Amino acid sequence: VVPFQEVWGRSYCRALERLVDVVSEYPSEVEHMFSPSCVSLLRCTGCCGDENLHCVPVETANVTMQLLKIRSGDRPSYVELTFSQHVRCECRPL
Amino acid sequence: EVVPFQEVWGRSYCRALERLVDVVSEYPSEVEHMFSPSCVSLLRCTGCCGDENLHCVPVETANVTMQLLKIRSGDRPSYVELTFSQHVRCECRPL
Amino acid sequence: RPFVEMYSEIPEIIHMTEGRELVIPCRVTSPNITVTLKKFPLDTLIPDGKRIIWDSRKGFIISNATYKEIGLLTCEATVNGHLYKTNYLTHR
Amino acid sequence: RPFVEMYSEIPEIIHMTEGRELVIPCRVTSPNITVTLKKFPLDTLIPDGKRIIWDSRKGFIISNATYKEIGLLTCEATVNGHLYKTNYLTHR
């Protein structure tokens, strides 16, 4: 049994790994397909103890990842893509 | 510094990750009531599977029991223990 | 034991509204006992003597409860080498 | 080092077609080296002699590729107690 305070801590307001599409961070890359097409990023999520608050980033940081671009017909490329990680979260009024 | 490619691949391929699911959606017969917290963290299969026509689906599940608070309209509140089904193992299948 | 109400891991539910006074009812036994007010995950509400008043017979009294007071709060005190907590949940 | 063409960090890309031949080209220097084909995260593809063929000068030959063979594949060999790896990325 997960004790209440853990249940609470787990859903309240935190920077949680979710899978994000590459094209949602690099929308000018339309023509092509990155590999992998989605990456793991830390994102602020939570129920905030109130349905009228939501969990937002209060401190962020950059990470760079190695990805591949398999091309239409040109040839494949290596690329290093920077994304923004959520480091700290807080509950704020919607 | 720079996250190596295989680590990038492995972290987004097909995996059970925590995401917030709200309790009343797991227990619709409980809509008239409120739970605290109103959402809980469960393991759910997620991933890009190396292919736009594949998706990551649960191949194995398990129960977790969670301690919650139930708030009732007009009645006293209660300590409650609810079970939910987690995704424990995931693999890639076609759409 | 310093707190009058015996402890539970499981918080006591307090109902509140933005604007109106909020009482965290963690009363105690002697005036000369130091009690920390914590709010999850990491805020400490420090008694200043005008918005956060520390009353040893009432608990902590908060005038103007903003959203910043909604959630899981804990009163802490250490007596005789042991740490004592009392939990509260605010629900608007 | 047993493999002819080193792919340790960045995998070589192999284009594959549903239902057709797929060669994972991890050919080796001497025909006596045992080679193991893995598919991330957990799969191991054993050469059974017909659907999957091991040919030491070619690599692994899979005769009817399915969706199960899309992704990150790794040829593994141990020489003198050292594990060596070559990675391929199949794409459709």
Chain A: residue nearest D12 by CA? A76
Are D28 and D4 in contact by the 8 Å Cβ rule? The answer is yes
Are D24 and D59 in contact by the 8 Å Cβ rule? The answer is yes
Residue C55, CA distances (Å) to A39, C2, C19, C31 in order: 51, 14, 20, 9
Whether residue A12 and residue C92 make contact (CB cut-off 8 A), yes or no, is no
* Residue B41: both structure tokens together: 């963290």
Q: Which CATH number fits domain A1-94: 2.10.90.10, 3.40.50.720, 3.40.80.10, 1.10.10.10?
A: 2.10.90.10
Instruction: Measure C70 CA to nearest chain A CA, in Å.
Output: 7
Residues within 8 A of C (CB atoms), B 30-89 only? 36, 67, 69, 71, 77, 79
**Resolution for this PDB entry, in angstroms:** 2.5
| Cα angle: D50, vertex D31, D53; to 5 degrees | 10
Which chain D residues are Cβ-neighbours of A78 within 8 angstroms?
10
Are D86 and D72 in contact by the 8 Å Cβ rule? The answer is no
Which alpha helices (H) appear in B13-68, and where do they start and end? 23-26
Q: Any residues with CB less than 8 A from the CB of C43 and at least 6 apart, and which?
A: C68
Q: Give the CA radius of gyration of chain C.
A: 12
CA–CA separation, B41 and A6 (whole Å) = 10
Whether A9 contacts chain B with CB within 8 A: no
The full 3-state SS of C12-71, as one line of letters, equals EEEECCCCCCEEECCCECCCCCCCEEEECCCEEECCCCCCEEEECCCEEEECCCCHHHCC
The one-letter code for the residue type at B65 is T
Whether residue B50 and residue D89 make contact (CB cut-off 8 A), yes or no, is yes
Domains of chain C: 1-92 (2.60.40.10)
Determine the residue among D40, D89, D90, D92 to mutate to test chain A binding: the one whose Cβ has the most chain A Cβ atoms within 10 Å: D89
* Residue C70: both structure tokens together: 């909604």
Whether residue A49 and residue C11 make contact (CB cut-off 8 A), yes or no, is no
CATH numeric code, B1-95:
2.10.90.10
Domain ranges of chain A: 1-94
Are C14 and C45 in contact by the 8 Å Cβ rule? The answer is no
